[PDB]
Design a protein around this ligand. Structure first.
Ligand SMILES: CCCCCCCCCCCCCCCCCC(=O)OC[C@H](COP(=O)([O-])OCC(O)COP(=O)([O-])OC[C@@H](COC(=O)CCCCCCCCCCCCCCCCC)OC(=O)CCCCCCCCCCCCCCCCC)OC(=O)CCCCCCCCCCCCCCCCC
Ligand SMILES: CCCCCCCCCCCCCCCCCC(=O)OC[C@H](COP(=O)([O-])OCC(O)COP(=O)([O-])OC[C@@H](COC(=O)CCCCCCCCCCCCCCCCC)OC(=O)CCCCCCCCCCCCCCCCC)OC(=O)CCCCCCCCCCCCCCCCC
Ligand code: BCL
Ligand code: BCL
Ligand code: BCL
Ligand SMILES: CC[C@H]1c2cc3[nH]c4c(c3C)C(=O)[C@H](C(=O)OC)c4c3nc(cc4[nH]c(cc(n2)[C@@H]1C)c(C(C)=O)c4C)[C@@H](C)[C@@H]3CCC(=O)OC/C=C(/C)CCC[C@H](C)CCC[C@H](C)CCCC(C)C
Ligand SMILES: CC[C@H]1c2cc3[nH]c4c(c3C)C(=O)[C@H](C(=O)OC)c4c3nc(cc4[nH]c(cc(n2)[C@@H]1C)c(C(C)=O)c4C)[C@@H](C)[C@@H]3CCC(=O)OC/C=C(\C)CCC[C@H](C)CCC[C@H](C)CCCC(C)C
Ligand SMILES: COC(C)(C)C/C=C/C(C)=C/C=C/C(C)=C/C=C/C(C)=C/C=C\C=C(C)\C=C\C=C(C)\C=C\C=C(C)\C=C\CC(C)(C)OC
Ligand SMILES: CCCCCCCCCCCCO[C@@H]1O[C@H](CO)[C@@H](O[C@H]2O[C@H](CO)[C@@H](O)[C@H](O)[C@H]2O)[C@H](O)[C@H]1O
Ligand SMILES: [Fe+3]
Ligand SMILES: [Mg+2]
Lengths: 46, 46, 278, 45, 318, 274, 48, 46, 46, 45, 46, 46, 46, 47
């Protein structure tokens, strides 16, 4: 599995994975904000 | 973990981290300002 | 508010989608401005612009990207911005004097600005190897060697309405002052661009009839009366048009010499062009 | 870069303009405060 | 009295360019190529040849099927009269399904023909995308044109497929007609409260207007520097001539900043495709997460307020 | 500071007015006399806009300098009843015209043709149609559009619906066709140049042969390196010009609904079929 | 120096500049005195 | 303070100062024309 | 102050003076036409 | 570049034209004030 | 603090200071003209 | 008038005539179909 | 004042002056038409 | 200026930290005055 890093540039994969992680975290957090049950700032009662 | 700086430029990452954290700090403050329970300028009841 | 899309009491999905696009648009704008800084950068701050009276380099904002390598068809990996062009520009001793010592003062040429490459007469430092097509032919060649081209896109239009499909061979050339400079002997065509580029003329009117000079087509106004009118330069000034190193080829450098010389006529061909309307 | 003497001549010119500008600004704000104070109380102005 | 680089005065015709050689698996190009004097004034005179491969043929077949379905339904709506077809040419359309069908498959004459025409039209444009992609790769070019086309596809799919699917009815989609799809455009804005207040419609117009602004700026600059062979832009990117410097200096002196021969085409490329991308996002937002765009603008404090000029109307049914 | 090739181009001459007096650069900007004027006009108009904003609201989108009432006709209005708009209009017009004259000074200095100032004159023509020519024909400066980011969108909305379906305006359908086609051409032009100079990694920079071959492979025609910039300028300038035509005929030369305009087409004796 | 002005030229331009500035300002001071006598522009606590 | 002209060319500062004065005089004169009290040609009362 | 012309070119200043004062004179005349009491053509009572 | 002599000649033509323009303008304002003064009183005009 | 001019160019800083304080001072004066208690031209009660 | 064909290419004249005749006969036949009186396949009465 | 023509090409001055006269005259006539007292073709009464 | 040495970097750093301390100190006082005017952290009831 270590040969993955002789195929792709380690920096490029680091930049792409972090960008995907940042986008996904933003998308999920706002997905929870748009629902009633998981809006922590909204303080909705379950 | 110091070897992280042999992959990504330290000069580039430091500057993009200040810009990135600028957006994130601005975003979270503005998200709280858009609530009612955490808008400190409005000071709504909690 | 309430409904689908609400994220808080004020924030909604369309609004946060908008700010998400703001962050992208900024990152794209910054990226685009960096691609803007691969020619002419870093900026050369002259001594007379800075309070310390020392020349410097300004990166600007955003700072220029790292050098970019264009691999070329002939097997030559060139880097941009090119080192030889930057080195030529910074070392060339301009034959001009600033009209004032402060920064932003215009240069006033000392000798002849047209042959010295000042202002609209200026040329870039380019390659001296004549360009080739993808197949290896000579890219810009006259019609005497590029014999597969004949003048006139339409034979019937060229035969029955030659005014709109002209053949400028044998046309007389006039300068901005109406004087006769000579006769067009040949046409130079780009094998890739499939267009005329230069009108080779002799100097039978103002010099030796055996001399050959290239007139760029965009400076030539091919008329309807077998006369080509060049508004760029005086007829007498056709003699100082730079000559080709080889009579049958032109390097990209000589293209910048020749088009540069005619472009310089826009200001320097006759007195008063530099001077305002009022 | 600039020498110390050039930089000190820069700062002498700067300090002269800074003092005049800030002095006029302090006087102007003292006049504006005597006219209409711009910090409201708990009940307004 | 100077030559304005608007029409090519002197033209030279040689043999037809058969194109750069393709890899030894591509279909042969067509053999038909002729030169046009009229087109040679504006630019390249040669018309044809054209490549047609698997993706090209299947895109044409899917597209012809779509055009036949739309055309025959258009013609059938005027009782098959070619005269009445010309009279009503801008008004006829292949109508989308009525709202009652939702996302199901409706009968042919109740939006079924529309759904088939939309499906084959979608397939032809997607295959045409693969064709633009492969023609670039076959020449060893970047796939920039195809992805720019893909950006235009996404707005086309957002308008016609994704947004109607997100809304749960094929009725929300746009009919295949000239004035009818203009009726769809206006009604869309009426229904969801003035699309002018949609911010991604604002951005879409920013990049659309900026695209016309950019092409006007760039096209005028290349013609103005045509005396220095500016239009040979590939040579100027790899070998910066004086035309590239005068183009950059012209705009540096004008607005304080410039581009390069290469970066100008990045600006124009991104402006073209951002116009169509913010367009798609704006369409996907309305109806789904924004009901009324003017009310959205009021909420976010962007609606101007107007002083009294008339006596306000009151809803009698309030 | 200057580009590393910029110095040799900064020469004297090319002005239409001002001569040597304003013929200099401040930083990257060439100044000229029309740069000083365009600066005075632009600052005057912008500061006047902010003053008008201070009297209603500072919210950026809700700022609005509105034209006077139609009852004012062509008379100059009180400042807070559209006179502020009228001054901003003459300031913006002067700012635009001196900007184009300044670009003409820059054109001559670099030996370029006047394509840029003229292409900008079309944009100025469209604004002049919006605030001068059409308000003149209709008979009141109040027909111009307000100076506000969101208030001029309501003007476009209401002026469009003054003709009940502005999509049927024949000159507007032409201008929209030119706008859509020019951004299509811009996508193709920008993309094709990037595709050649930036091929797949490991490939040489291609030629103008590949550019012509690409579009002859795709659509069966290629307009060429020179043709793409003539057509690109042509499509964008027709976009501006037919914008001017479509709005100048909306009200001065057509007061009914635009769909009704097509009544002549429906009545052609060739295809009436009744 | 930058601008190529000798120290005496800088001192001479300074005196004419400061003179032109005081004359321009003095006229403004007079014009403001006339303007104030016409209608004062600092409202009292109760307005105008 | 005379040394300010060893830094700025007299022609450019005078062009910028005069351009500033022209903008300023027009803005102040026009702002007064906007007000009801200082619109002298309008001639309101006090 | 004849020295003013050793900084500003006199020929170009004369031309700039005429065009500028033309704009200002038209502006002032147009302003008076806007007022009620100084519109000399309309002739409202004073 | 301009000498003191040619500068003074430029100022000579400036003064002749400035005084004629200023002189006729002063008369214009005196006639304008004789017609309708433009400084309103406490009640206006 | 004359060592500040060993870092920042004194000329460009001074020009930047005048342009920035120009816009700032216009901004503040306009803010006061937008209010009701500090618009000295309107002269509302305080 | 035989010399008319030494000037004008016979093919272009004949193509031009044929295009005009085709368009004209189509237009006349269509105009007749558009009228109530001469629509021969509409089968109206006079 | 004859020295003035040593400074400008008389042709460019005649163009400039006759351009002012043409535009000024048209504007004055048009303003007079726009009135209800000096509109001569409208038959305004006094 | 771009290629500062160690002694020049240490000298610039101390002046930067002194400038930042003065800037922060003046701001801290400004906030202590702003709190005296109107506090900005509400209680559970609000303001
Ligand atoms: C829902 C909305 C989205 C729906 C999208 C559907 C349709 C997708 C089409 C849209 C993309 C078209 C343009 C892409 C493109 O440039 O293609 C050229 C390029 C040519 O490839 P090639 O032939 O291999 O290139 C050979 C050489 O490398 C030669 O290559 P090169 O050197 O010319 O290419 C380099 C190119 C690299 O280009 C790319 O890799 C593609 C661009 C990446 C981003 C694209 C996203 C655009 C759409 C979203 C934008 C709005 C989202 C905002 C938030 C939501 C609202 O340069 C760039 O980096 C351009 C990006 C600008 C910098 C990044 C800005 C982000 C910073 C801000 C965020 C952080 C704060 O095509 C691609 O690389 C594949 C793109 C696939 C995109 C899929 C999406
Ligand atoms: C998304 C849509 C909505 C948003 C749309 C956009 C928002 C509105 C538009 C805003 C865009 C424009 C903003 C910047 C304007 C450009 C100014 C500039 O130079 O840019 C530099 C900047 C790059 O900086 P750089 O040129 O590398 O700087 C290098 C050194 O600093 C170079 O050092 P240096 O030696 O040049 O330093 C100069 C320094 C030195 O100053 C002095 O010493 C003066 C002494 C004289 C006495 O100061 C100056 O001399 C220049 C100051 C300005 C002078 C103005 C005088 C003009 C006279 C009349 C001409 C008409 C104008 O380029 C930009 O970022 C502008 C483009 C960004 C926006 C693109 C369009 C976005 C559209 C989105 C769709
Ligand atoms: C006598 C010859 C010149 C002159 C010679 C000098 C010299 C020499 C100097 C000055 C300096 C100053 N001069 Mg001066 N000055 C003159 C006469 C004046 C007059 C006047 C009407 O008489 C005024 C009001 C000024 C004003 C000023 C100040 C700008 C500055 C002193 C304060 C300072 O240190 O800035 C400090 C402020 C900053 C450093 C930041 C400024 C603002 C920045 C850019 C950020 C704010 C932007 C703002 C928020 C944007 C608005 C928001 C928008 C809505 C987005 N000068 C005459 C014309 N002047 C000094 C100076 O330039 O300091 C560097 C200086 O050394
Ligand atoms: C409901 C309303 C109607 C409608 C009513 C109108 C009305 C009314 C108008 C248009 C106009 C247009 N409409 Mg429409 N239109 C409708 C729907 C559409 C749709 C669509 C999605 O359906 C499209 C694509 C269009 C497209 C168009 C364009 C053809 C045209 C605007 C371009 C233009 O004028 O450029 C011209 C560009 C300019 C005028 C810009 C001027 C530039 C100046 C010279 C320089 C400014 C510089 C600036 C100040 C610098 C800033 C400072 C610096 C950045 C620091 N309309 C609907 C159906 N439409 C307008 C038009 O054609 O007018 C000419 C117009 O008036
Ligand atoms: C036969 C001789 C020539 C002639 C020979 C000369 C000579 C020689 C000279 C003049 C000069 C002048 N001439 Mg002459 N002149 C002639 C006859 C005339 C007539 C006439 C109707 O007969 C007029 C009205 C004028 C007018 C003028 C003045 C402009 C000027 C004298 C005042 C001055 O010093 O301005 C100076 C005032 C300024 C420069 C103020 C600048 C105003 C700026 C530009 C304001 C810009 C802001 C702008 C208005 C903002 C617009 C916003 C709006 C809302 C649109 N001349 C004849 C035709 N004239 C003198 C001159 O111009 O010197 C410079 C001069 O030396
Ligand atoms: C005609 C084809 C298209 C086109 C062409 C075009 N535009 C051009 C050019 C060309 C060829 C230039 O050379 C010139 C340029 O140099 O651009 C960088 C320009 C330009 N087109 C611009 C903008 C622009 N073009 C637009 C449109 C178009 N431009 C057309 C679609 C639009 C639209 C559609 O809205 C805008 C906003 C500028 C970036 C620039 C011209 C800059 C200029 O004139 O500067 C003068 C000085 C100023 C600072 C301007 C403001 C001065 C005013 C007194 C204040 C503002 C008044 C205004 C009425 C406010 C209105 C606001 C409300 C509507 C919200
Ligand atoms: C950046 C966004 C802009 C954009 C970009 C863009 N468009 C693009 C592209 C790009 C980058 C392409 O590469 C692609 C293209 O081919 O460009 C030339 C295309 C394209 N954009 C097109 C249209 C288009 N683009 C539009 C818009 C836009 N395009 C955006 C504004 C619009 C609008 C405004 O609505 C339209 C209508 C097409 C011309 C083309 C893609 C064509 C396509 O997908 O065709 C599919 C196949 C068919 C329709 C089949 C039918 C075609 C013929 C009738 C078949 C003929 C059969 C036979 C060969 C002959 C029979 C007759 C016999 C008698 C001989
Ligand atoms: C009789 O005519 C003959 C045969 C002689 C030829 C003449 C043909 C003529 C004249 C045709 C005229 C055509 C015209 C004028 C058409 C006008 C078309 C216009 C203006 C269209 C404009 C917009 C239309 C849009 C945007 C359509 C969008 C539809 C979409 C995107 C549909 C998507 C559908 C999909 C992807 C289908 C999915 C089906 C699945 C499988 C998902 O269903 C289960
Ligand atoms: C040629 C048209 O030129 C234009 O004509 C129209 C009508 O004639 C004039 O308009 C004029 O008459 C209309 C009639 O309703 C008046 O309301 C308007 O106030 C008045 O200015 C324009 O001011 C003129 O510029
Ligand atoms: Fe291009
Ligand atoms: Mg419909």
């Amino acid at each position: 599995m270590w040969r993955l890093w002789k195929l792709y540039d380690p920096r490029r994969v680091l930049i792409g994975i972090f960008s995907w992680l940042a986008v996904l975290a933003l998308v999920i957090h706002f997905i929870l904000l748009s629902t009633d049950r998981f809006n922590w700032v909204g303080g909705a009662a379950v | 973990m110091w070897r992280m700086w042999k992959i990504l430029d330290y000069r580039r990452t430091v500057v993009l981290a200040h810009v990135g954290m600028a957006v994130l700090a601005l975003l979270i403050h503005f998200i709280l300002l858009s609530t009612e329970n955490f808008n400190w300028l409005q000071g709504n009841p909690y | 508010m309430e409904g689908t899309g609400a994220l808080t009491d004020y924030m909604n999905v369309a609004q946060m989608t908008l700010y998400a696009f703001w962050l992208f648009l900024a990152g794209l704008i910054v990226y685009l401005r960096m691609e803007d800084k691969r020619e002419g950068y870093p900026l050369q701050a002259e001594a007379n612009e800075n309070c310390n009276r020392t020349p410097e380099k300004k990166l600007g904002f955003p700072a220029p990207p790292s050098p970019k390598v264009f691999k070329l068809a002939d097997g030559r990996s060139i880097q941009v911005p090119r080192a030889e062009k930057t080195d030529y520009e910074l070392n060339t001793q301009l034959r001009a004097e600033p009209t004032a010592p402060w920064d932003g003062a215009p240069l006033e040429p000392t000798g002849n600005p047209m042959v010295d490459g000042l202002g609209p007469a200026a040329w870039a430092k380019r390659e001296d190897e004549p360009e080739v097509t993808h197949g290896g032919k000579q890219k810009i060649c006259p019609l005497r060697v590029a014999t597969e081209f004949e003048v006139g896109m339409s034979r019937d239009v060229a035969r029955f309405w030659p005014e709109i499909d002209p053949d400028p061979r044998g046309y007389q050339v006039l300068g901005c002052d109406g004087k006769v400079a000579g006769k067009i002997v040949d046409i130079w065509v780009d094998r890739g661009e499939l267009r005329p580029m230069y009108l080779e003329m002799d100097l039978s009117g103002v010099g030796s009839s055996g001399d050959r000079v290239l007139l760029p087509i965009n400076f030539a106004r091919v008329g309807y009366d077998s006369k080509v009118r060049v508004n760029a330069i005086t007829g007498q000034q056709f003699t100082d048009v730079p000559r080709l190193r080889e009579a049958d080829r032109i390097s990209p450098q000589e293209e910048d010499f020749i088009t540069g010389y005619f472009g310089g006529g826009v200001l320097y061909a006759v007195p008063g062009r530099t001077e305002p309307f009022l | 870069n600039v020498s110390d003497e050039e930089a000190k001549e820069f700062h002498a010119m700067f300090s002269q303009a800074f003092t005049v500008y800030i002095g006029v600004a302090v006087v102007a704000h003292i006049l504006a405060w005597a006219w209409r104070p711009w910090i409201p109380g708990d009940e307004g102005f | 009295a100077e030559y304005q680089n608007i029409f090519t005065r002197v033209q030279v015709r040689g043999p037809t360019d058969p194109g750069v050689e393709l890899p030894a698996a591509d279909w042969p190009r067509t053999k038909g190529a002729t030169h046009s004097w009229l087109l040679g004034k504006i630019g390249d005179a040669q018309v044809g040849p054209i490549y047609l491969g698997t993706t090209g043929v299947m895109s044409i077949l899917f597209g012809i099927v779509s055009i036949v379905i739309i055309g025959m339904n258009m013609l059938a709506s005027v009782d098959w009269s070619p005269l009445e077809f010309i009279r009503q040419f801008f008004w006829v359309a292949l109508e989308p399904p009525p709202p009652e069908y939702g996302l199901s498959l409706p009968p042919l004459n109740d939006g079924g023909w529309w759904l088939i025409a939309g499906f084959t039209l979608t397939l032809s444009v997607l295959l045409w995308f693969a064709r633009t992609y492969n023609r670039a790769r076959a020449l060893g070019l970047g796939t920039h044109v195809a992805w720019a086309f893909a950006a235009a596809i996404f707005l086309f799919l957002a308008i016609g497929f994704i947004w109607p699917v997100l809304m749960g009815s094929w009725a929300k989609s746009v009919p295949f007609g000239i004035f009818p799809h203009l009726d769809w455009t206006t009604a869309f804005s009426l229904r969801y409260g003035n699309l002018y207040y949609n911010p991604f419609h604002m951005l879409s117009i920013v990049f659309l207007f900026g695209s016309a602004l950019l092409f006007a700026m760039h096209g005028a600059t290349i013609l103005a520097a045509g005396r220095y062979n500016a239009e040979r832009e590939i040579e100027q990117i790899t070998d910066r001539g004086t035309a590239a410097e005068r183009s950059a200096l012209f705009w540096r002196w004008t607005m304080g900043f410039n581009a390069t021969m290469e970066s100008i085409h990045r600006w124009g490329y991104w402006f073209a495709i951002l116009c169509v991308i913010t367009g798609g996002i704006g369409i996907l937002l309305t109806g789904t997460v924004v009901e009324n765009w003017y009310l959205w603008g009021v909420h976010h404090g962007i609606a101007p307020e107007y002083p009294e000029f008339f006596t306000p109307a009151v809803d009698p049914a309030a | 500071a200057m580009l590393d090739f910029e110095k040799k181009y900064r020469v004297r001459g090319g002005t239409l007015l001002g001569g040597d007096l304003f013929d200099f650069w401040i930083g990257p900007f060439y100044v000229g006399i029309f740069g000083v004027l365009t600066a005075i006009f632009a600052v005057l108009g912008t500061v006047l806009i902010i003053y008008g904003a201070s009297q209603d609201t500072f919210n950026l989108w809700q700022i609005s300098i509105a034209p006077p009432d139609l009852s004012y006709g062509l008379a100059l209005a009180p400042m807070m009843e559209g006179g502020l708009w009228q001054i901003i209009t003459v300031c913006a017009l002067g700012a635009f015209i001196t900007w184009a004259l300044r670009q003409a000074e820059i054109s001559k200095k670099l030996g370029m043709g006047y394509h840029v100032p003229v292409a900008f004159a079309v944009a100025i023509l469209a604004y002049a149609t919006l605030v001068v020519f059409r308000p003149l024909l209709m008979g009141a400066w109040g027909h111009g559009f307000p100076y506000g980011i969101l208030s001029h969108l309501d003007w476009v909305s209401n002026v469009g619906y003054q003709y009940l379906h502005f999509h049927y305006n024949p000159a507007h359908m032409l201008a929209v066709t030119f706008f859509f086609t020019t951004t299509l051409a811009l996508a193709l032009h920008g993309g094709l140049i990037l595709s050649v100079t930036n091929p797949k990694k490991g490939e040489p920079v291609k030629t103008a042969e590949h550019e012509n071959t690409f579009f002859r492979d795709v659509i069966g025609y290629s307009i060429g390196s020179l043709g793409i910039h003539r057509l690109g300028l042509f499509l964008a300038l027709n976009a501006g010009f037919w914008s001017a035509v479509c709005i100048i005929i909306s009200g001065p030369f057509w007061t009914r609904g635009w769909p009704e305009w097509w009544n002549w087409w429906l009545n052609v004796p060739i295809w009436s079929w009744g | 120096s930058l601008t190529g002005l000798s120290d005496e030229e800088a001192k001479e331009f300074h005196s004419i500049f400061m003179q032109s500035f005081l004359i321009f300002t003095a006229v403004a001071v007079v014009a403001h005195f006339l303007a104030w006598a016409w209608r004062p522009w600092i409202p009292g606590a109760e307005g105008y």
